[PDB]
Amino acid sequence: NTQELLDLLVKCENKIQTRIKIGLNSKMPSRFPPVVFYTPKELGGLGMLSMGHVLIPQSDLRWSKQTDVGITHFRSGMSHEEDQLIPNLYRYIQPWESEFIDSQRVWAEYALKRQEAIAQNRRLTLEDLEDSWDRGIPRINTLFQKDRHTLAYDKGWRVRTDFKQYQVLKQNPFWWTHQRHDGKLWNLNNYRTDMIQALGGVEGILEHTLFKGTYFPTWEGLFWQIPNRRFTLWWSPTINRANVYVGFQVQLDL
């Protein structure tokens, strides 16, 4: 609802891109796709969960493989419109309106199931609760957690989390909830799937990586100035191309 908020988020993301692209070479180039960032660390990249419109160009999704007939070039799905890498994280949060509505619909069913279990002599059936497992008001996993009895004898953790700013010299974003009593405050694996889909799958998002070859004909995780060098090398073609910088090409002595 805050238009200034969204504009400032975009400005801050661009400001981070400043020195996120300028940390390497002091040029501030032209195009520089965000795929150097929005690849998660599971593949090697950063994992920048973004909100602003990072338009991915259709001319940055080309890949080919010389297997049996030759270099069969292909392209991801971008014929409809521009590539919306992060359309909106608001779509993948289930906001407090949906949260409260689902809670009013789910806690009643939970109490009904608990009454049926007490009547039918049933225990805490995780299978029956799998439908009402999503978020609750606090995470229902806390209801069926391992420290249920141990965590139930501690009332009033919100004030403790609030005044932790005085009990610690580091900002603790725990005002939203407690990781134990309240549980998790989000879910993002669906967003990661959507991201990898928008980049043209793993093979599309990884055509920039150097392992087109490397004796690694498939995806096999082997993740061992270590990360800076690994990053500027694992994106050296996508970074040290010619359609980003100016055309002052320079070759090396050997």
């Binding site: 504009d7 501030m28 032209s30 602003g52 419109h53 338009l55 160009p57 259709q58 419109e81 521009e82």
Partner: peptide
């Protein structure tokens, strides 16, 4: 220019840290 430049939030002339100019023929 392949993009629509209308779905963007408000406007984007150039974020190259050099937007000295200010004009879009609105008047």
């Amino acid at each position: 220019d392949h993009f629509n430049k209308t779905i963007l939030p408000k406007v984007m002339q150039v974020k190259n840290f050099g937007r000295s100019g200010r004009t879009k023929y609105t008047h």
